[PDB]
Amino acid sequence: SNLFYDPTYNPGQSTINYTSIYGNGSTITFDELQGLVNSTVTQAIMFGVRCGAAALTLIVMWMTSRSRKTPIFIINQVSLFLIILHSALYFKYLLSNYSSVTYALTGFPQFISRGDVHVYGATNIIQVLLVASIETSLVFQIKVIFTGDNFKRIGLMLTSISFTLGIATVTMYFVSAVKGMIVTYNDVSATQDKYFNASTILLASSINFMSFVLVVKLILAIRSRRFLGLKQFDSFHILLIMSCQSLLVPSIIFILAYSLKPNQGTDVLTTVATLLAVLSLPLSSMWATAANNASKTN
């Protein structure tokens, strides 16, 4: 109890030294371990926000729906349910042997078990299915906004470019999942990071491009609506607001996740960006039905 009396002292710099595979000493400061713990806590906060927002959008979509068995309704229920399931599996990863400082510092591979590898592969499979559901919803949105045009030259080309981007990022997420599953099946302490960054940049650019297509086509539809009167607030303004939201907000979150400092756990901001890119469609359907019935009421 020598250092209690000292009024000026920094216990964040003091040395934790533990048994490890590099050596029996293995000294590290309290501030680096607290940075690790803050990274895990920030990941837990973002995945908690994801799970809670998806759970309540699932409840409100079950309650505030005029139409069920509708295809976009089913795609959105699959998307929100896969967000809930992926966040549940990520909560089960964060409170597990891999995330723990018993393996994040002391790299003893006996702590890891085959169940954690199975859960890892399951979480990657659920993320692949979630990206498939997101791209399915976006290609359905483009393929339903580009029907009806009488000059199908830029429309079919834009829809094929969107389908190519969607199947490209689903394939990139799929090959990233298979490559991570085989490299974890071989060695439990190995990682692949190139395919993840490729698939994440492909997903961000996919959401950006399809939101650009949606914003420009909704601007042209609103201009064609101004030719028919109709300067009232309508469903198309809600679609433009939520499309510009999915154009601006998760792009800014992706740029922020690539922009901020590393090793603080803020790299999972891509999840919150993916989450808002999902929630662009159910909240617009809720706002559209609410504005329809409230305008018929008013």
Partner: peptide, 23 residues
């Protein structure tokens, strides 16, 4: 006129948006 063609395009996109359930 382009009134009628734009209105038919608007009706088809609104009806397919309502059928697919965004509206």
């Amino acid at each position: 006129a382009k009134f009628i063609l734009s209105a038919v395009t608007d009706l088809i996109i609104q009806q397919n948006l309502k059928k697919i359930g965004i509206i």
